[PDB]
Amino acid sequence: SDGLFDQFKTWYEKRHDYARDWKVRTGGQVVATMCTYTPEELLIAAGMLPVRVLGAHEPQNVTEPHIFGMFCPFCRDSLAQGLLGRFDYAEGVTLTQSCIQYRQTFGSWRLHVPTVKWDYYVPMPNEVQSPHARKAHYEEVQAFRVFLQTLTGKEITDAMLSDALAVCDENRRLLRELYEYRKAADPKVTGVEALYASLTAQFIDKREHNEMLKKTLAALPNRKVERKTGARFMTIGSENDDIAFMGMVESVGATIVIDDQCSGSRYFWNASKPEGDVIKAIAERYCDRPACPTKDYPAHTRFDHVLGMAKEYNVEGAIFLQQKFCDPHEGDYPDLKRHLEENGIPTLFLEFDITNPIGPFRIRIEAFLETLSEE
Amino acid sequence: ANKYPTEQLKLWGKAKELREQYYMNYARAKEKGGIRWSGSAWALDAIPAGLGEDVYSLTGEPYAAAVAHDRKFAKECMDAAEAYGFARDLCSYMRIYWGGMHLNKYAFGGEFPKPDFVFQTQICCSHSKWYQHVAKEEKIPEFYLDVGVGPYRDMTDARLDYVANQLHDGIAFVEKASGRKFDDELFIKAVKNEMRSTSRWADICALNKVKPAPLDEKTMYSLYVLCTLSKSSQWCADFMDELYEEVKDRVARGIAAVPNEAIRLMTDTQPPWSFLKIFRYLETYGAVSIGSLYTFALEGIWEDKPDGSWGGRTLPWDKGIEINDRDTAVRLYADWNLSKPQWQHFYDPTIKSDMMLRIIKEWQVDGVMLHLNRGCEGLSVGIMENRLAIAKSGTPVMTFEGNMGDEREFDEVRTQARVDAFMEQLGVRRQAASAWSH
Ligand SMILES: CC(C)(COP(=O)(O)OP(=O)(O)OC[C@H]1O[C@@H](n2cnc3c(N)ncnc32)[C@H](O)[C@@H]1OP(=O)(O)O)[C@@H](O)C(=O)NCCC(=O)NCCSC(=O)c1ccccc1
Ligand code: SF4
């Protein structure tokens, strides 16, 4: 009704129009990024627009020659976007190492997307719990900085890196401030609205995105809430970027008040620590971030993080959205489910392909709501 | 049919006995106060070996493959893991292993023997999740070596530092978990034995380049397995030396694994363990599989030789490099393992594409049969790009879908028909070539 979040919705729907126009306005390069561990500060410092590759959630038949169908819908949907030419404006492509399935999206993209002029794979340590991981990632971030300086022919100075980190940290802090409103009994921010904001953060110029977040926060204190909250849900998964599916969830008598997913909290959660060596500040921000399941060993630190968010946001039911074939989240699932249920949070499991008829999921959500009414 | 002399392997019985003894030793490890540990065939097993000569591993994937050979027990184990709540499309070895732990049954008899600790390498995402569940269910300490530093050919000093420094943490971990003091001399001996066994397995595979091939891949599955059990053991290194002498003699005498050899095939990853009879079927066509990147380099460690060919990696002491202290040994041990050919495709599938094309060339391969293995994300990533690179090269290549550990995703009838069609295709290509080049 009031359209406060309409700019984020426009940015999502017209993401590619945005990037092309950004290139006209700035003369800069665009870089297709993969996985939320990409050290975007370095790309921004190099004068580039990072744009996270996401899927289109449409039927596609272009990936079968490149990625075997035992792998997840997201890695295939993402690759399809490159093969279809929808990122033709992006000179670069980069992935920072996590899930091995996603590495195929990167490898097939750099080999077969003919508009790619350069590529870079960052082998960020998986074992962020090791006392040696932060030094290793410091060196990986420095090596990528050296690569980018060479590629552009322009020195990337500590001041340039610090300014880029400041913009990213401001975005992280503003998104956390937005999320704080979700803790209220009648949230002034729906889960869909939070999702538009946190997803577009990943492919809009962060200075422009920060300005829009600040405008949103200026409006929230006096925003009139008309909808009923219903049950307080949390969504959990890998990416979880199907906004249309989340809108259904919030139309049946519930509000998504918090999430554990890379479209949302797992992307932005922590700002960097104050620190004079900017390479250390950047590298450690990513090692200290809530971990992808692939990076969560020997301890399942994720379980404490998910339960902590669920309690702090007063969650009544948690919905696991799982991509078919998703090994890292499948490996964590049975015990993470048990951890939430043993701490008083009932759970629901839903599995997703590239496209799915919405009807069967709505029936399952409606049945889950009935269970929350009991006991 | 038989153009070549053929002979059965004399060391076959010893290869079978060493494997059986490995599994029996794990189960009996506590009778005399020994140590038991579990982890991948890719764990850096020389580290636990510094704790004594009575340190017995159970490597997870070879054990699960042994279970998969018993279709009924494999089904029961997978049913138990499913009942716990794990998705059926997770790694079939990992599901088998978990199920057998919950059932508390060892494939070689008795209860499932509790490990004292987990010592694991992490490169596939499921490497952590496999043993996180095990360590919680057994209530044991667990250590993971993160080897994810990218391709060996891109290695930096800092990347090698990361792996070496973690190995020093691993030493401290195994001392704490076992209560024993780590011995530098036993450790160095084990590093050297692992270098010996892995290089020597590569040397043996390189003997398969000649016509006729002295070994067929099905026979090789009972030989490459020893390095997957305890590559850092004296017994494995010494047996690889013995086996190399026998295979050298087969080459010298013109001995073929397959007496009617006319077609040389290359495979790829993890075959369906309860359906190895497919190889005997192919032999009726005069087709022999000479190996695969998987058989050659799951544990074999390779280098470029002076003539440009692929061969076993040179042992450091044959190169003037001394290994006289812990820190030197750790760094060389890290570097040796990081060169593993079967780790490179986790970063860049074209490295594996080039490796497969080189095998086709150097082993004189006529056709390729690629398993699209739904049971193993780690070895299947990049498989379709590898197929495309082989297809572009002009060598015939077919695919079949399967699952190395879970028969429910392997269709024997359809796969055998595809393999039959492939044999027909190879004959047709031979006729066309003869006709053009008369
Ligand atoms: C034990 C099996 C499974 C079966 O063995 P089989 O040979 O089929 O069966 P049998 O033992 O019952 O013996 C019957 C056969 O003996 C034959 N024969 C008799 N005499 C001789 C002779 N003198 N010479 C030659 N052969 C002789 C006779 O012809 C007969 O064969 P046929 O009936 O005609 O066809 C064996 O293949 C094996 O150990 N595989 C390794 C499994 C494993 O652990 N792999 C490691 C996985 S790790 C991994 O994947 C991974 C790790 C890390 C990361 C990622 C992944
Ligand atoms: S998927 Fe393959 S590489 Fe990964 S744990 Fe299983 S057997 Fe190992």
Author numbering:
A (entry chain B): 2 to 376
B (entry chain A): 5 to 442
Give sentences copied directly from the paper behind this entry.
An alternative to the classical Birch reduction is provided by dearomatizing benzoyl-coenzyme A (BzCoA) reductases (BCRs) from anaerobic bacteria. BCRs reduce their substrate to cyclohexa-1,5-diene-1-carbonyl-CoA (dienoyl-CoA), representing an ortho- rather than the para-dihydro addition of classical Birch reductions. Architecturally, the heterotetrameric enzyme complexes are composed of two functional dimers: the ATP-binding dimer coordinates a subunit-bridging [4Fe-4S] cluster and serves as an ATP-dependent electron activator, whereas the catalytic dimer is predicted to contain an FeS cluster in each subunit and the substrate binding site. In this study, we heterologously produced the active site components BzdNO from Aromatoleum sp. CIB and provide a first X-ray structural characterization of the catalytic dimer of a class I BCR with the BzCoA substrate and the dienoyl-CoA product in van der Waals contact with the catalytic FeS cluster.
BzCoA is embedded inside the active site channel of BzdO in an elongated fashion from the buried benzoyl head to the diphosphate of CoA at the channel entrance. After the diphosphate, CoA is kinked by ca. 90° and the 3’-phosphorylated adenosine tail is attached along the protein surface. The benzoyl ring of CoA is laterally displaced relative to the [4Fe-4S] cluster, such that the OH2/OH group points to on one side slightly above the benzoyl plane of the substrate. Trp46, Leu302, Leu383 and Tyr97 protruding from the N- and C-terminal α/β domains create a predominantly hydrophobic environment of the benzoyl ring. Access of bulk solvent to the active site is completely blocked. While C1, C2 and C6 of the benzoyl ring are not directly adjacent to protonable residues, C4 is 3.1 Å apart from the [4Fe-4S]-OH2/OH group and C3 is 3.6–4.0 Å from the [4Fe-4S]-OH2/OH group, Glu65-OE2 and Ser44-OG. The thioester oxygen of BzCoA is hydrogen-bonded with Tyr97, Tyr298 and Gln274 suitable for stabilizing negative charges by hydrogen-bond interactions. The four irons are coordinated to three cysteines (Cys95, Cys128 and Cys380) and a small non-proteinogenic ligand assigned as water (–OH2) or hydroxy (–OH) group indistinguishable at the current resolution. The structure of BzdNO with the bound BzCoA substrate was used as a starting model for quantum mechanics/molecular mechanics (QM/MM) calculations.
